[PDB]
Each structure stands twice: as C-alpha cells, then as structure tokens.
Amino acid sequence: NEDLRLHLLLNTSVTCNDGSPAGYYLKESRGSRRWLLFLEGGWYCFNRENCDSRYDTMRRLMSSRDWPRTRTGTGILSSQPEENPYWWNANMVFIPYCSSDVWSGASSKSEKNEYAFMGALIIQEVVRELLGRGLSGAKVLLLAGSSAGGTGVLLNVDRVAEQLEKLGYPAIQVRGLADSGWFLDNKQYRHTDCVDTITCAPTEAIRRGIRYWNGVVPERCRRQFQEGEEWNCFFGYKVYPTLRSPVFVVQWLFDEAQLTVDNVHLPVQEGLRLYIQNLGRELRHTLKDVPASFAPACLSHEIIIRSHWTDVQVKGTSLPRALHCWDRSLHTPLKGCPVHLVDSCPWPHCNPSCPTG
C-alpha cells in the first residue's frame, strides 16, 4: 500500500533547501478528529561546503524535485491496527525533511544565500494548508518526529499551538511526540576540535547552523539563554522545561547518533565501558522528571515509524500502549497503564526486547 499522497505547498515561497517547494504526504481519515503530523529526520548541514556535499548525495533531504507521488505509512503512520495499535484511524501526515536545519530555519534562498533554510516555516505552512483540508475540525494535533525531527518537535510544538490559537482554533489540543531527538551536549569519548564537519561537535555545529539558517527557538527558552546562546534550546533537557504543550519523549538510552557525535564506534575496555554506562545514567537522569517518556536500554536509533515499533517493551509495556495511556491521562496515575517508562539497567540490550538489528 502507498497510502499517503504528496501535496506540494500551495505557497511556493516556502521551500526546500534548493528553492523547490516543500510539501507533505497526507492520508485523510474521515470522521477522525485526530491528526498526526510527523517530522522526518536526517542530520543537518551548517555551511556551504557541507551543504553542497549533502546536495550531491542526499538530495532528497534538500529538494522536492525527485520526491515520489506517494509513500507508505509505517509504524505510527500505519493505518492498520495490527501495525499501529495506537492511532491507526488518525489522519496521517508525513512532512519530508528538506531544510537541513533541524526544523529551525526561517531564511529564503536569495542574492546572499545559496540555500533556503525554512524548516520552521514549512511546519507553519503545512498546518495552515491542512486547516482547509479538515484540520479545522481536529480535537488533537500530535506533532511527532524522529531524530532531527524529534528535536524539531521540541523546537516547534509550542509555535504550532500559538499559531492555531491565533488563527482562531483554541479547541485543537496540540501535543508533541519527540522520538530519538533528546541529545546531550556531553564530552566526547575521544575529542576533536571543530576544524571540519567530522571533527565539529553538535554544540558548535548548531551554533554555526543557527546563524547560517536564521534558526529560531521557542520563545521562553530564547528568553532564558539569550542572544548568542540559543543553541542550548536544541538540547531536549534544556528546552523541555520551557514548553507548555504536553510532550511525550521517546529516547533509546544508548542512542546511536548520540554515540556517533560522541566519537564512539563499537572487546570493550574499562574506559569505554564507564563512558557508555555514564551516558545511560545521564540520559536516565535527564528523564527523571519527564512524566511521559519511553526510554529503553538499547543501542539503536529512531522507533516510531518502524514497522516493528510494537515489539519493544519497558517494564512489560510497549510504546503504543504507553502512548494510549498518555492519551487517557490527558482526558492521578492510571491502574496498569503507565506513561513514565525508563529502563534502569545499565548496558545496551540489558532489556531483552531491544531491536535485534
């Protein structure tokens, strides 16, 4: 089944990196008042040289010119209850990541800019165009996303809420689901000064990206960190306390992209063993006061649009169940239907339900 259909944005000034129109894939579900808007991930680029390389060999992440007319909804975007016990009957939207800016940008291609970085405006424009296609009747809009798209949820969920309130739709409850987008600005296992793309740690790359992209962050977080320090708001544990919309956080404790930016590449000796155990402990610590969260002790990356997303469990509860319990909690804790699920065991795949690879 190729069930989500492409719509290029009617406002063609809201563009992917190369100026081609951005867009979204939609599968409507008549009579459902639930809307799931999913933000794709896929790293980022932060200067002309590394964006030019991404344009050669990752062009679908910078351009709509070669996008297919349809995509199959998978995982949480599946319309089959067998694959998606949580929201199989929802209106489904997949928003391709073509702005390379962790969904933060608000800059057009121009005389001075080789590329457009419009991630934050793409989300706003998708929402605006969907209102005319049934979103005006929604009761819940779940803004979800994986990897850079998960960070994109944290950066944009409150702006979607503000946008709907000020367009006159205060009854739409905006919520976020951030998958694999909760990163730590920690010490690398082996250290590299930022002199090129590979050596350059995410705090510095994001610092440069914000200026290159004209990147924007949520207002309360911006007001805390102030000018020049907005990069802090790309780190979940710093931006989450500032957010007003309910946000469910999904994060593997030993996320593969976290390990990549930490220069860890997997007989593990003591220094690396301690490094990995400390990373899991720090991640667990950052989630202690996140009431809706699912954080399994696995070495993996992304979950919610994988077809076998139903398989992993923490304390005997799967993610689709936890998300269902979250919906119920947003109607005191619920008997047998938990929403805070963080593994405490200290090594990858100490949870037997971890993805096998």
Ligand X SMILES: CC(=O)N1CCc2ccccc21
Ligand Y SMILES: *[C@@H]1O[C@H](CO)[C@@H](O)[C@H](O)[C@H]1NC(C)=O
Q: Which residues of this chain interact with ligand Y, rule CB under 6 A? A: 11, 13-14, 121, 125
When the beta carbons of 232 and 318 are compared against ligand X, the nearer one is: 232
Question: Which of ligand X, ligand Y, none does 209 bind, CB closer than 5 to 8 A by kind?
Answer: none
Residues 252-311 that bind ligand X (CB under 6 A): 257, 261
Closest CA to 284 of 239, 344, 350, 347: 344
Residue 73, helix vs strand vs coil: coil
Task: For residue 244, give the amino acid letter.
Answer: R
Written as six digits, the tokens of 286 are: 């950052």
Question: Which of ligand X, ligand Y, none does 234 bind, CB closer than 5 to 8 A by kind?
Answer: ligand X
In 194-280, the DSSP E strands lie at 247-250, 254-255
When the beta carbons of 13 and 353 are compared against ligand Y, the nearer one is: 13
DSSP per residue, 109-175: -BTTBSS-B-HHHHHHHHHHHHHTTTGGG-SEEEEEEETHHHHHHHHHHHHHHHHHHHHT-TTSEEE
Question: Which of ligand X, ligand Y, none does 102 bind, CB closer than 5 to 8 A by kind?
Answer: ligand X
Cβ 121 to ligand Y shortest distance, Å: 4
Written as six digits, the tokens of 329 are: 């909690």
When the beta carbons of 177 and 261 are compared against ligand X, the nearer one is: 261
Adjacent-strand bridge partners of 142: 36, 175
Q: For residue 203, what is the enclosing H or E element?
A: helix 202-213
Written as six digits, the tokens of 184 are: 């730590």
Site membership for ligand X, residue 189 (CB under 6 A): no
Site membership for ligand X, residue 234 (CB under 6 A): yes
As annotated, the active-site residues are 147, 255, 301
One symbol per residue from 13 to 42: x for binding ligand X (CB under 6 A), - otherwise; what is it? Answer: ----------------------------x-
Residue nearest to ligand Y (CB): 11
Closest CA to 172 of 131, 124, 123, 120: 131
Task: For residue 214, give the amino acid letter.
Answer: N
Cβ 291 to ligand X shortest distance, Å: 23
One symbol per residue from 134 to 173: x for binding ligand X (CB under 6 A), - otherwise; what is it? Answer: -------------xx--x----------------------
One symbol per residue from 205 to 224: x for binding ligand X (CB under 6 A), - otherwise; what is it? Answer: -x------------------
Site membership for ligand X, residue 102 (CB under 6 A): yes
The number of residues that bind ligand X (CB under 6 A) is 12
Q: Round to whole Å and give the CA distance between 82 and 89.
A: 12
When the beta carbons of 83 and 230 are compared against ligand X, the nearer one is: 230
Question: Which of ligand Y, ligand X, none does 147 bind, CB closer than 5 to 8 A by kind?
Answer: ligand X
Cβ 340 to ligand Y shortest distance, Å: 37
Distance of CA 28 to the CA centre of its chain: 22
C-beta of residue 78 within 8 angstroms of C-beta of residue 36: no
When the beta carbons of 10 and 345 are compared against ligand Y, the nearer one is: 10
C-beta of residue 93 within 8 angstroms of C-beta of residue 135: no
User: If 0-12 CB within 10 Å is exposed, 13-18 middle and 19+ buried, where does residue 296 land?
Assistant: buried
Which stretches of the chain bind ligand X, using CB under 6 A?
41, 43, 102, 147-148, 151, 183, 202, 206, 234, 257, 261
